[PDB]
């Protein structure tokens, strides 16, 4: 029965398609060639850097590497604020609380361990350890100081409750690992990217899938909302980013180049929603005009794979981390 | 040209850097050993001779080892396997008695040996449960009698012929069933060879 369900889903999606985004946006002036220059190079780690996240004040950031360390950088001066040793050296995710009081760090130990940065004691202590996942922890994001969304290799994403430590809700709709998590600007919806070559639109309040987005051809490795809150972008292993549409339940346009064969490891946006940065395994990041689909620049400064990527909240700088221990603050 | 507070912050950052350097130098002289298996292979015997990842430590002749054991992590291997690039060796395990099919064991060996991220790491294959294999063979396209001496050699050959990169990759093999305090000697020897190979480079000599 479900076969004709998906067939009529396709029929409705096509019936709602009348004009390609390219046809509409051809007449806009191209953004022009993009100047980007490495303004700072943060150099503390001793192994591969696996994730990073910008503080909400656009000045502080946290990075996680495999030598069992979290480091809090002051990006304006490249100073070090904190260096947090970890119990499990195998980390794969990192997050900064919107208030700035807590950071999180998951990995291969299956546990999302939340850290406390502001204590009367003078040091950083493990506020809590969240347990209940049966596979490596891939992504974790903060909703506020008392809620957090995790995404694991056991095919499920779950909403926690830090005080009690329990799981308030569990989102069970994928059929493969889940490697990426994105939170809506109003923190009432969120999307995740699984190795099924699909992404889903969850619903934090009641915990149930709303729309299933497909069209890729390999493992989706990263995902990010458009700043408007009505679209998102996904990066996969077939050298192709895409930009989907929530209000139309459809894909809008594709960013593919014949000279790109490697896979995407992270994507993000610019504060206005005209550029689409995207890290690659070619060791270098690219900047895509988000309407013309034409390239607008290249950020070639890394001597190994680019594994993480983030744009500050005021949209004023970009950070990239690579498997050579080096975080670079472009601009 | 800096405030007093900025200078104190710089001093704190320098102390953080010093501690990171000391910890890195401490942890760059310790041998890391991934430990794969096949299930009922008998990893328990090896781990007791000395939810997620499991870690063990032991010290032999002023050397410090760490045996990570992924084990019961049931997820796609290609996603987290690259985290283990740079391990000193790989203690593969397999039970002779299981001829649970040995085809799965050989497929896993083929995937691990013939892989990127591991195209230069020596594989310290072990062959445990020797005794039970011997009693079973006593009763139970192979040319040769059902005897231990030649059957063990044939199995060693079958496992060693799955390494296409037959040069620049070493796959040591050892039989053991009584745990006669020898299985640490074999690992120590293979680790010594890998250390010497890493010391030829880095000394520019190559």
């Amino acid at each position: 029965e479900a076969e004709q369900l998906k067939n009529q889903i396709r029929d409705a999606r096509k019936a709602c398609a009348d004009a390609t985004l390219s046809q509409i946006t051809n007449n806009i002036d191209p953004v022009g060639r993009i100047q980007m220059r490495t303004r700072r190079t943060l150099r503390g780690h001793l192994a591969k850097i696996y994730a990073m996240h910008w503080g909400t004040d656009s000045r502080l950031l946290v990075s996680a590497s495999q030598d069992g360390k979290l480091i809090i950088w002051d990006s304006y001066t490249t100073n070090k604020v904190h260096a947090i040793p970890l119990r499990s050296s195998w980390v794969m995710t990192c997050a900064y609380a919107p208030s700035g009081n807590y950071v999180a760090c998951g990995g291969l130990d299956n546990i999302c361990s939340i850290y406390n940065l502001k204590t009367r004691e003078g040091n950083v202590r493990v506020s809590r350890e969240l347990a209940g996942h049966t596979g490596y922890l891939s992504c974790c994001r903060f909703l506020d100081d008392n809620q957090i969304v995790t995404s694991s290799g056991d095919t499920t994403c779950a909403l926690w409750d830090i005080e009690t430590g329990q799981q308030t809700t569990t989102f069970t709709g994928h059929t493969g690992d889940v490697m990426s998590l994105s939170l809506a600007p109003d923190t009432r919806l969120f999307v995740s990217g699984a190795c099924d070559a699909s992404a889903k639109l969850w619903d934090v309040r009641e915990g149930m899938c709303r729309q299933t987005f497909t069209g890729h051809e390999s493992d989706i490795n990263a995902i990010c909302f458009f700043p408007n809150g009505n679209a998102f972008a996904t990066g996969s292993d077939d050298a192709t980013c895409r930009l989907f549409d929530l209000r139309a339940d459809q894909e809008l346009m594709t960013y593919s180049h014949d000279n790109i064969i490697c896979g995407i490891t992270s994507v993000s946006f610019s504060k206005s929603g005209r550029l689409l940065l995207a890290g690659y395994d070619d060791f270098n990041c690219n900047v895509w005009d988000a309407l013309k689909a034409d390239r607008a620049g290249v950020l070639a400064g890394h001597d190994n794979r680019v594994s993480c990527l983030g744009v500050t909240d005021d949209g004023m700088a970009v950070a990239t981390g690579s498997w050579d221990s080096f975080l670079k603050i472009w601009n | 040209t800096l405030s007093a507070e900025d200078k104190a912050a710089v001093e704190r950052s320098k102390m953080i850097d010093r501690n990171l350097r000391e910890d890195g130098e401490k942890a760059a002289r310790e041998v890391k050993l991934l430990l794969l298996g096949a299930g009922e292979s008998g990893k328990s015997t090896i781990v007791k001779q000395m939810t997620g990842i499991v870690e063990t430590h032991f010290t032999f002749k002023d050397l410090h080892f760490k045996m990570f054991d992924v084990g019961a992590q049931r997820s796609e291997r290609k996603k987290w396997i690259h985290c283990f690039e740079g391990v000193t060796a790989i203690i593969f395990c397999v039970a002779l008695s299981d001829y649970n099919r040995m085809h799965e064991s050989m497929k896993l060996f083929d995937s691990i040996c013939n892989n990127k991220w591991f195209t230069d790491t020596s594989i310290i294959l072990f062959l445990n449960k020797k005794d039970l294999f011997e009693e079973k063979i006593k009763k139970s396209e192979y040319a040769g009698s059902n005897t231990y001496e030649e059957a063990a050699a044939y199995i060693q050959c079958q496992f060693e012929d799955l390494n296409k990169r037959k040069d620049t990759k070493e796959i040591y093999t050892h039989f053991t069933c009584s745990t006669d305090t020898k299985n640490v000697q074999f690992v120590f020897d293979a680790v010594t060879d890998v250390i010497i190979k890493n010391n030829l480079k880095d000394c520019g000599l190559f």
Partner: single-chain antibody
Amino acid sequence: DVQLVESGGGLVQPGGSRKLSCSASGFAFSSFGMHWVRQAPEKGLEWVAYISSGSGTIYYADTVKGRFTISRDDPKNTLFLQMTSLRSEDTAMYYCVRSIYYYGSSPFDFWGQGTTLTVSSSDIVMTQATSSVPVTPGESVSISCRSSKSLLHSNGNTYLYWFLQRPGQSPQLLIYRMSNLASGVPDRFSGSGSGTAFTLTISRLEAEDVGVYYCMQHLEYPLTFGAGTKLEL
């Protein structure tokens, strides 16, 4: 329980070589800079020393350099001040303030308890005119502290602090960097101002606020306090 207890008081002959100790307890004492603020009996505060975390950035005021030495016992969590050639002008209480400096930190937040010492017999100026202000528990007091050199550094911070010593207790932080409110302080207190002009504002005053208010600068060493502005009724 972050107590910070001192010992080493008494009566000393002139020229002596007494020595004071300050035993830390229940915090990471090895990553906090430590000062030795004093207070003459009927007078205001006066910064005396500073030994950084990971010793080796020692500073002293004048009138002490060469006769006072400060040392840190990291493993046993103990702080020493070693004095020599004590004159009759050195008699004062002695405190053991802590401080930690990183982006967003709040120095001087916890003070010690005191040590009554009675020896036998191009700086920056901060002014706190109109001391001993009488007010009713109604509302709206405004304490004014004025400096000589502008404290607005080029990076953006305005390194000015406020402290309050209630009758018979030790001072506690209220406002750091002229606008940030130290933790544990009710939101009644507010600080504001521009270069060389600052004004602590208290609204909805209640009984517990009666005391003395001190303004301190942290632009450059030596740190220099104000004269105090006692609040009455």
